[PDB]
Design a protein around this nucleic acid. Structure first.
Ligand code: A1AAQ
Length: 91
DNA sequence: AATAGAAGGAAGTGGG
DNA sequence: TCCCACTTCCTTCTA
């Protein structure tokens, strides 16, 4: 099963949910969620994982925060904005 | 207050 | 056994 950071990177590459997520500075790996359309993206994550309950953005962001230590994804001090690591981007 | 973003401890679930 | 990689629940805190 796909890892969350890869799910997000793949969405950004394909462009299939451009109203819910977008690059801010793609060279730096910074990206941002839509305030109004993030929940539809969270729902898609939960359905792709086959989880028991409906996925929410809050729960998806709780998972994102766990990457802070290992570094795959870090929180940017901007509303709804995060940053992929160079290692994640290279793959 | 209402709305909403952000944090994180802790317990539960998956698939090795 | 026991870590992976989250998921779920709840409370707190900040803007
Ligand atoms: N578990 C703890 N003890 C804990 C410790 C620290 C915490 O801090 C939370 C926090 C940190 C930084 C920034 C923010 C809020 O940011 C916002 C940005 C933009 C908007 C907007 N324009 N609508 C609204 C809010 N909230 C929370 C709980």
């Amino acid at each position: 099963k796909i890892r969350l950071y890869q799910f997000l990177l793949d969405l950004l590459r394909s462009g299939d949910m451009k109203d819910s997520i977008w690059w801010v500075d793609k060279d730096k790996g910074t990206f941002q969620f839509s305030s109004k359309h993030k929940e539809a993206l969270a729902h898609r994550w939960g359905i792709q994982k086959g989880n028991r309950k409906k996925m929410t953005y809050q729960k998806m962001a709780r998972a994102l925060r766990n990457y802070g230590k290992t570094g795959e994804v870090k929180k940017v001090k901007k509303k709804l904005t995060y940053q992929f690591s160079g290692e994640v981007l290279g793959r």
